[PDB]
Amino acid sequence: WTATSGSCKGRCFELQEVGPPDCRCDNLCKSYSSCCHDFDELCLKTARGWECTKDRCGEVRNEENACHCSEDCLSRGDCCTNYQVVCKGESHWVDDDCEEIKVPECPAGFVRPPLIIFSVDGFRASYMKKGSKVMPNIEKLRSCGTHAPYMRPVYPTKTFPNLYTLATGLYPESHGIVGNSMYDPVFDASFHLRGREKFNHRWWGGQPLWITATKQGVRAGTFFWSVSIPHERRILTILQWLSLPDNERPSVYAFYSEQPDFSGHKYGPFGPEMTNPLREIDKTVGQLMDGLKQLRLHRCVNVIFVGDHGMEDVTCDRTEFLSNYLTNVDDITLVPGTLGRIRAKSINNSKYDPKTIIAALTCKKPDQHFKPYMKQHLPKRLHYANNRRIEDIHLLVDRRWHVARKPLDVYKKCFFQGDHGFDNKVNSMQTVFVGYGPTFKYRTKVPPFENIELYNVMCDLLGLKPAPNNGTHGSLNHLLRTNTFRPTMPDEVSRPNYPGIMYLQSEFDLGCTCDDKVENKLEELNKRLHTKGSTKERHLLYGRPAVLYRTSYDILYHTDFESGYSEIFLMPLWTSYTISKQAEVSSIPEHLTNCVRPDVRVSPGFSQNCLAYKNDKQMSYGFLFPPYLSSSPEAKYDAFLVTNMVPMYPAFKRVWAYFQRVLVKKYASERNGVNVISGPIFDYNYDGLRDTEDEIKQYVEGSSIPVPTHYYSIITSCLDFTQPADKCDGPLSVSSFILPHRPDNDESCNSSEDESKWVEELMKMHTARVRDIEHLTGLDFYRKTSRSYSEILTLKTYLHTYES
Ligand SMILES: *[C@@H]1O[C@H](CO)[C@@H](O[C@@H]2O[C@H](CO)[C@@H](O[C@@H]3O[C@H](CO[C@H]4O[C@H](CO)[C@@H](O)[C@H](O[C@H]5O[C@H](CO)[C@@H](O)[C@H](O)[C@@H]5O[C@H]5O[C@H](CO)[C@@H](O)[C@H](O)[C@@H]5O)[C@@H]4O)[C@@H](O)[C@H](O[C@H]4O[C@H](CO)[C@@H](O)[C@H](O)[C@@H]4O)[C@@H]3O)[C@H](O)[C@H]2NC(C)=O)[C@H](O)[C@H]1NC(C)=O
Ligand SMILES: N#Cc1ccc(/C=C/C(=O)N2CC[C@@H]3CN(C(=O)c4ccc5[nH]nnc5c4)C[C@@H]3CC2)cc1
Ligand SMILES: [Ca+2]
Ligand SMILES: [Ca+2]
Ligand SMILES: [Cl-]
Ligand SMILES: [Zn+2]
């Protein structure tokens, strides 16, 4: 119940929120069905439209008007935004030349430049160019401010997960809002667009910008708006708030537009009906920019123009149905659409086997427009697993398609031409970012970045300290004229050992044979020089990675490669090597096929053994530095050391062998030499972070040799590819992957064919940021370069997407 006979007189769009059962007058009172009777009367005036006309100038104030053209209106702070244009012969903001903003130009009492977030729902990245002729305001912002060609949203590319990601800098798995529709098993509750449930605070984790603001004494305007409040009333409300006395005036605001998402759903991303909503958005920006100019704030306020996601062509006839794959189609609940999530209909059912479901859905049709995964096997770049609201079974859907359960679910539950929510690397899902203001840069293009990064910057723009988040603070410093945040490298926690020759062959009982008894003054000091690390500046191009946790490990040098070897995990954490363009591929000679040599630098007790690999028939082994790329037949023996060896399922060796034998060389050719760092990853609990020694869920049978869940590689070269990787003078170029260590290749429906038809396709799907690998390994890369740390942070957040 709400006693709704209180009044809104003098309380229109209040900032503090009065709790039930007193009535409300704030921008969300409508969504709670708890506005005071007079709210519509007092706070939602509409009379006379939104624009001053020639006759309205210096009128006599009429409180019934939606906005005012009267002489006192500048003082009351409630003129129509075009009041100055018509009545005082002023120019629209958009018609004024782009002049640089070297210093904030703020009116007295303004302690800091305010921030306005202008959020546009469904604003697909390609609109900035494709619709530019009809969006002059937005185009002034873009070309005068700082902009990226596009901004990458989070997965799923849905509204709620993305709008709350923006506000927190957190992944959906972390903030809790993993979809527009969710079931929480511990709540036995369901979060949906229609219903009251979504209003409970228990769904919304993390700390959103406005809470972060308040707690640090920066006052915030309320971010969310009720749909029924027209957009023009939203802008004047932000302008009225900006006229408030210094002590009550918030420093951060948000505006939201349902367009163009609303139309895009009806008419597709580029339907001819799309021109108008874009025209309308632009108008609303114009209005805001005019309102700011009236207030002398247009050279004081930082404005962020940002979208939550893009829009793809989707229609009813492009739906795949589960009922065409499953028999037990009524045992399962499917959360449907542009992404699928599956669970049991009742947990009072022990005969629910996810494996059968996964199997029944795998490569079953040659045309198939989705692919099933257990959530932990989803690409690691999506970070879509560590939450109980994310169902074990996930369906990743082809762009342009839908997944539904039964055909009835579509005809009785076509009406739409557009949708979104696909994999966040898909082009049609990309969205926009423009920043304009005194703190942003002038006429500056920046490379594309991820929406998870903006919270840090917004906190910077406001002189706030960000709550712990998934952005990488400093990686967007290149957007800003002036910086609140100087980032610093984390300190190394573990210093390495540098073992020399300490053990004799016969001290080893590993069950590892090699034909190595093939056999100077000149060339016997030289290979010793290599073991002391004389070719280190060649294979370790950016300094050794730092270990950011306490552990026990040794740096091992060789002619061709260098490793940080973990005495705990009994394999290297990292293995670094440069392959120049002219380097040549060779084969494993017939006599060395099964060669594995003991490492005299490392104790038997801290080494693996071939015996275990013999006894485990699920588990074979592979090597981190590839024998195929040895510089010389002598050097090749280095690659067969027990300390270069890592466990690998036969199925995975196929992917790995192809990567090492063919692709490394190909990359070195195209990119003019590459530096490769490769290693194991252990993330059994799929939280995206390194598991500790006591969290290992799987060992090679009858041993203490832990089995990795993933294998990564970081491949780096010179951005200017006229220079060799090992002699780059400036900016670097990187690409990375985190391959899932899986006992089969069921993910690749073409796997029965030659590795040249599927393997690179798997690796592209599993691309990664260096920073994703950092979270997973507890390492810190690029410690020694000639580049600024900011630039290196940017490099570390880069993701190579393989889109056109
Ligand atoms: C991305 O960035 C985020 C934020 O920095 C990182 O997430 C953080 O990771 C650490 C380690 O996993 C977490 O620390 C643990 O914290 C708990 C207590 O946490 C409570 O307080 C904090 C602080 O205000 C809240 O943020 C927490 O909120 C979580 O739970 C609520 C429900 O209560 C939910 O509404 C939120 O969405 C959020 O849930 C998400 O995180 C939790 C993990 O806490 C996870 O279960 C869930 O699936 C969601 O994803 C919470 O109220 C503390 O008890 C722990 O200590 C224990 O472990 C240590 C191990 O050393 C033991 O020594 C000790 O004895 C304890 O047993 C941890 O310290 C931190 O909470 C978490 N923060 C957030 C906001 O998620 C991610 O790791 C980053 N991801 C990547 C890939 O980089
Ligand atoms: N940072 C930040 C920040 C800034 C502003 C804001 C502002 C938030 C805000 O007012 N809204 C966003 C959240 C939802 C969106 N919505 C929908 O009905 C809806 C829209 C598009 C869809 N496509 N497919 N299903 C869809 C469903 C109603 C609701 C109110 C409006 C939120 C966060
Ligand atoms: Ca949206
Ligand atoms: Ca983990
Ligand atoms: Cl296979
Ligand atoms: Zn939408």
From Swiss-Prot:
Domain SMB: 4-47, 48-92
Effect of H265Q: 20% of wild-type lysophospholipase D activity
Region (Required for secretion): 773-794
Binding site residues for 1-tetradecanoyl-sn-glycerol 3-phosphate: T159, N180, D261, H420
Chain positions recorded as Ca(2+) binding sites: D683, N685, D687, L689, D691
Molecular function GO terms recorded: alkylglycerophosphoethanolamine phosphodiesterase activity; calcium ion binding; lysophospholipase activity; nucleic acid binding; phosphodiesterase I activity; phospholipase D activity; polysaccharide binding; scavenger receptor activity
Effect ascribed to mutating D261N: Abolishes lysophospholipase D activity
Catalytic activity as recorded in UniProt: a 1-O-alkyl-sn-glycero-3-phosphoethanolamine + H2O = a 1-O-alkyl-sn-glycero-3-phosphate + ethanolamine + H(+); a 1-acyl-sn-glycero-3-phosphoethanolamine + H2O = a 1-acyl-sn-glycero-3-phosphate + ethanolamine + H(+); 1-(9Z-octadecenoyl)-sn-glycero-3-phosphoethanolamine + H2O = 1-(9Z-octadecenoyl)-sn-glycero-3-phosphate + ethanolamine + H(+); a 1-O-alkyl-sn-glycero-3-phosphocholine + H2O = a 1-O-alkyl-sn-glycero-3-phosphate + choline + H(+)
GO biological process: cell chemotaxis; cellular response to cadmium ion; cellular response to estradiol stimulus; estrous cycle; immune response; negative regulation of cell-matrix adhesion; phosphatidylcholine catabolic process; phospholipid catabolic process
Carbohydrate attachment residues: A3, N348, A360, N470, N750
Record-listed 1-hexadecanoyl-sn-glycero-3-phosphate binding positions: T159, N180, D261, H420
Binding-site residues, Zn(2+) 1: D121, T159, D308, H309
Residue numbers spanned by region Nuclease-like domain: 541-804
Region annotation (Phosphodiesterase) ranges: 94-447
PTM remark: N-glycosylation, but not furin-cleavage, plays a critical role on secretion and on lysoPLD activity.
SS bond partners: C8-C25, C12-C43, C23-C36, C29-C35, C52-C69, C57-C87, C67-C80, C73-C79, C98-C144, C106-C300, C316-C414, C363-C749, C512-C610, C514-C595, C718-C728
Coiled-coil residues: none
Family: Belongs to the nucleotide pyrophosphatase/phosphodiesterase family.
Protein name (database record): Autotaxin
Organism, as annotated: Rattus norvegicus (Rat)
Gene expressing this chain: Enpp2
